[PDB]
């Protein structure tokens, strides 16, 4: 279907407690496939999905080298941030990074991303055109100029349109059996009385992949927000996702409320009624 | 597949 690959890294300085904690993860759509943790024993990029274990030693050696190199880059970036923001060498700080590519249903390139955040605030982000940057502030402005003079945008662009797409397409094929299927939500509704004149209706969606889903309560066919709760989509731990939405109703009016469920694995949106 | 980030210095 339509698809993405993403990498995330988080560096956390811990002055006096040693070098920064570094943790990186790779995703294809909503499926994690690799990880690296600077505090782990192996000091290796490690598999997190079975289809990535098809790759041979040369892959693992290469990805390990490149991820370790990146941990060193971002460690240095923690250092440089201290000087730009004029901060004490004693603080603990956080640097976060994300990049990736989207491809169409037959593997055509659609989009690339590259972004940094410092202490949870945007720092620098490659623009949609993949040839320039949005600097969040004056610090990131210096980085932007530095990246322009060296041709960082070109080298990021070529990665996003080339290696990123090529890898994504390959992972999709090797992991077709699981990455290329949707799990439509299994749905049901529950009824609980809260008093003698009120009940709770809860709409459930379980066992779905991917995570994107919408759940909507209507009363007489009209969107209802009052007296509802809606939890954040949540992982089951087994690769699939869970969600629910609840509405308070007066006893004897249950038949007036409807729950709608939308998910790519559903040909037509579902409707549940008590 | 991870990129090279040698140039991504702030």
């Amino acid at each position: 279907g339509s698809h993405s690959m993403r990498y995330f890294s988080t560096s956390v300085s811990r002055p006096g407690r040693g070098e920064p904690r570094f943790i990186a993860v790779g995703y294809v759509d909503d499926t994690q496939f690799v990880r690296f943790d600077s505090d782990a024993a192996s000091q290796r990029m490690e598999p997190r999905a079975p289809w990535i274990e098809q790759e041979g030693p040369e892959y693992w050696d290469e990805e390990t080298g490149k991820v370790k190199a990146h941990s060193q880059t971002d460690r240095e970036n923690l250092r440089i941030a201290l000087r730009y923001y004029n901060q004490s060498e004693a603080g603990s700080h956080t640097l976060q990074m994300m990049f990736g590519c989207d491809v169409g249903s037959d593997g055509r390139f659609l989009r690339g991303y590259h972004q940094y955040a410092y202490d949870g605030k945007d720092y620098i982000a490659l623009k949609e055109d993949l040839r320039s940057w949005t600097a969040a502030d004056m610090a990131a402005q210096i980085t932007k100029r530095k990246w322009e003079a060296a041709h960082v945008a070109e080298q990021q662009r070529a990665y996003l349109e080339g290696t990123c797409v090529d890898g994504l397409r390959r992972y999709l094929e090797n992991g077709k059996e699981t990455l290329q299927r949707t799990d439509p939500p299994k749905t049901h509704m529950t009824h609980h009385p809260i008093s003698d004149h009120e009940a709770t209706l809860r709409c459930w969606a379980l066992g779905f992949y991917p995570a994107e889903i919408t759940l909507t309560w209507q009363r007489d066919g009209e969107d209802q927000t009052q007296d509802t709760e809606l939890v954040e989509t949540r992982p089951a731990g087994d690769g699939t996702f869970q969600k629910w939405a609840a509405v308070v109703v007066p006893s004897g009016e249950e038949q007036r409320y409807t729950c709608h469920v939308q998910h790519e694995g559903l040909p037509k949106p579902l409707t549940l009624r008590w | 597949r991870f990129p090279l980030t040698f140039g991504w210095c702030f």
Partner: T-cell receptor
Amino acid sequence: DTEVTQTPKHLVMGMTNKKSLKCEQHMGHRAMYWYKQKAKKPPELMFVYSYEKLSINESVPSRFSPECPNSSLLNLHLHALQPEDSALYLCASSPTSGIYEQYFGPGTRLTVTE
Amino acid sequence: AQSVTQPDIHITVSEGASLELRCNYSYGATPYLFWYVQSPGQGLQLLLKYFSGDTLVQGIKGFEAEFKRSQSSFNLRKPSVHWSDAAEYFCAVGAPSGAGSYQLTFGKGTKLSVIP
């Protein structure tokens, strides 16, 4: 000066001797390399140092003993070699950030004889 | 992992004619790319490097190079070769080692003979 310097430029050794190659670099670089080169072959990496720490050892026999006194200097101490160790010993330097590149020294021309 | 191939170990040109020296690499990303030249006595001199952006690079000694992504090639070119260009030539890739610190991997080299 974008120049890595090596001494001695030429060296002759028996199989008993101890000698030291010295390499120096003023570019502010934090990565330095030792290579060995035989005739008709490309440079073969022996050692990488990052931040005065040994990062890569390409199974270098113990008769070569590397040292990093500071970010500017790299030494190679030579002890009880064989004739087959005769080679061009190239020192090199590189940045650890920005645009990757390696600057080579002129090399030490080493002859070990029986 | 990262290997570099110079398919032609030995090339001969007549002085004043043009030169192409072939180089291919094999790596899961786009590395840094280089051509070095070495005379018999000396160490290695950098000719040109690719980081880069534009596929056509300009170097010293009248040398240029073309990066071809679909090929993974980085071929050394020179319009009109001088007799003194006769030397050893090495392309190289720069990329992370297993330890994450960067390193050069050389091709086996190309001997250039020029007929003066």
